[PDB]
Amino acid sequence: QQEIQQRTSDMLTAATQLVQDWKQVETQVYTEGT
Amino acid sequence: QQEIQQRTSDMLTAATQLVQDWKQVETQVYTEGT
Amino acid sequence: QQEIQQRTSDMLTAATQLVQDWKQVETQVYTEGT
Amino acid sequence: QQEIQQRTSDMLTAATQLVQDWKQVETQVYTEGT
Amino acid sequence: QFVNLSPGSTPPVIRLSQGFVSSLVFLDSTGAPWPIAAYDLGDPSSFNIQWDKTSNTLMIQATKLYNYGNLAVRLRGLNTPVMLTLIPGQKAVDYRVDLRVQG
Amino acid sequence: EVIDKKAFKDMTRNLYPLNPEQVVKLKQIYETSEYAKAATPGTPPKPTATSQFVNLSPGSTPPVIRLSQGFVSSLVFLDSTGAPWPIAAYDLGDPSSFNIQWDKTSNTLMIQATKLYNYGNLAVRLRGLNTPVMLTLIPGQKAVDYRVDLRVQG
Amino acid sequence: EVIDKKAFKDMTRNLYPLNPEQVVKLKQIYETSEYAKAATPGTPPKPTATS
Amino acid sequence: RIIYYIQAVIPGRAWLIGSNGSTLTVREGSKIPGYGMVKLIDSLQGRILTSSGQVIKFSQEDS
Amino acid sequence: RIIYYIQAVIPGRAWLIGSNGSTLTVREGSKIPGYGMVKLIDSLQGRILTSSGQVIKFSQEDS
Amino acid sequence: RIIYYIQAVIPGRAWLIGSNGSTLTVREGSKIPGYGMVKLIDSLQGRILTSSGQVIKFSQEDS
Secondary structure, three states: OOHHHHHHHHHHHHHHHHHHHOOOOOOOOOOOOO | OHHHHHHHHHHHHHHHHHHHHHHOOOOOOOOOOO | OOHHHHHHHHHHHHHHHHHHHHOOOOOOEEEEOO | OOHHHHHHHHHHHHHHHHHHHHHOOOOOEEEEOO | OEEOOOOOOOOOEEEEOEOOEEEEEEEOOOOOEOOEEEEEEOOOOOEEEOOOOOOOEEEEEEOOOOOOEEEEEEEOOOOOOEEEEEEEOOOOOOOEEEEEEOO | OHHHHHHHHHHHHHHOOOOHHHHHHHHHHHHHHHHHHHOOOOOOOEEEEEEEEEOOOOOOOOOEEEEOEOOEEEEEEEOOOOOEOOEEEEEEOOOOOEEEEOOOOOOOEEEEEOOOOOOEEEEEEEOOOOOOEEEEEEEOOOEEEEEEEEEEOO | OOHHHHHHHHHHHHHOOOOHHHHHHHHHHHHHHHHHHHOOOOOOOOOOOOO | OOOEEEEEEOOOOEEEEEOOOOEEEEOOOEEEOOOEEEOOOOOOOOEEEOOOOOEEEOOOOOO | OOOOEEEEEOOOOEEEEOOOOOEEEEOOOOEEOOOEEEEEEEOHHHEEEEOOOOOEOOOOOOO | OOOEEEEEEOOOOEEEEEOOOOEEEEOOOOEEOOOEEEEEEOOOOOOEEEOOOOEEOOOOOOO
16 A cells, blocks of 8 residues: 555645745736826 | 556656646737837 | 654644744834825 | 653753843943934 | 724724735815825735825735734824724725725 | 557546645645634734823823834824924833834834833933933733823923 | 545645644744743832932 | 624624724623623624624625 | 722733823732732733732723 | 626626626625525536526626
């Protein structure tokens, strides 16, 4: 039953990227024209 | 049986390539004149 | 009974990380304009 | 019977750490605004 | 909201949302826009402000999800500072808050 | 040709080890985890306002100001006529616990606490005054003063 | 077919070895330890103004 | 009786606003007119149920 | 008799605010007018013991 | 009666607009005048079922 950890290991890093995507939020912007 | 692994490997190569093609979206172009 | 130390190790590193965020305190900003 | 000796290790660093803080006293700043 | 300056009343509470801008427009009781002199903020990492220097408007971007803060503001003719509470994660988010002050 | 179907189904399996419902569950429990992380035990203090009279008697007791961590509290000083009184100078005990934003002329004092239980003292000299005013600042109460207005007998 | 469920719950265990209520009581012991640390022994002195 | 509505729900404190235009924030155990004594404040699901059995929630639509 | 709300509470010292606006800081052992003796001061839970048995607390509206 | 059509559909919330010019956003748990009680809002296909089985959708020419 080593096959459990094989699908556990890759899904550990797989979920790590999307929460790193879910970690950040970038700033609003302001623009004046004349 | 190794045909499964070979087909999966080059299939993964092609699939990753085309999803890399589908991943990006470029930016609008604006042009002025007088 | 060897799983205790592997249970102990990661969450203590999770503990030491989390308290560091709870020590994070930033200053203020006095915005002045005319 | 080794529980004293490890507790002799950890608490020595901790007690010296907190007693550094009580000796850590920082001075005031005078502010003049005309 | 009709902002009050009672010495024991509750300060007003501003609902915040993740990333979306919340706007605040400040006028007196008669309806003329009161220009803003200056302000101070608590926890600048959670809130980003594009305060144009000659308006009665404020734009806030709540960066975090659950961290709550406070604000102090003061207007051009106003002497008393105004303190506000900033609460994120509410089920009624405000794209715009009108502030009709009692001055 | 069914061997190609086997390759394709294990291809999908190894392409996405995460299910969409797994994505849903992970996002839900992650938001729950960070909410519990931000959530603090104990009751939060009540946001209050005070208007209090400063007594400058040479046998009296100095006024006390309640503070909360990180939140800037505003102090405003006014004389008996209600007009604000500008400040000549000020000095704060333990500057590492509190930071003051104060423009050179106005009387408004914006104080932000940095330490949870470290308490200090404040000495202020005014324009028309000779006798300074001494106040104490205590953090960690059950009601945070957003503003303290100080009526002075002078 | 339950291999995926077991891998998912194991990944949850790996991601967080702590209960959220364990996080909350960790915040409690953190605040209480800070209160004990910054607590001062003895009677604090009385603030006085004299002439 | 004037109906109050919740302004903002956090753990610990509660912000409630009625039709009179006054916002009031309270702790857990306090006496409130028309609703008796508040025993429990729920940080989830947008409702507060008092010891008098009375439930104050947010608005039906202004929420 | 003049009531007192707990204004500031630390271990050791205590601060009370009177009905007329009178403020007082006190130590552990003292005779309080109209209540008797300051028996025990607890920084936790905001409870002050009295020789009469009275419990000084924070206000209901200020909490 | 006024016919409504779905303008925007997301998980959780939904947006609908009538012929008169009134546009609203409804969650799952709410009521609707003239149609009753929201039984189901689906985040996909733009399908909302009301209490009387009334169907809220996109328009025929606006799809």
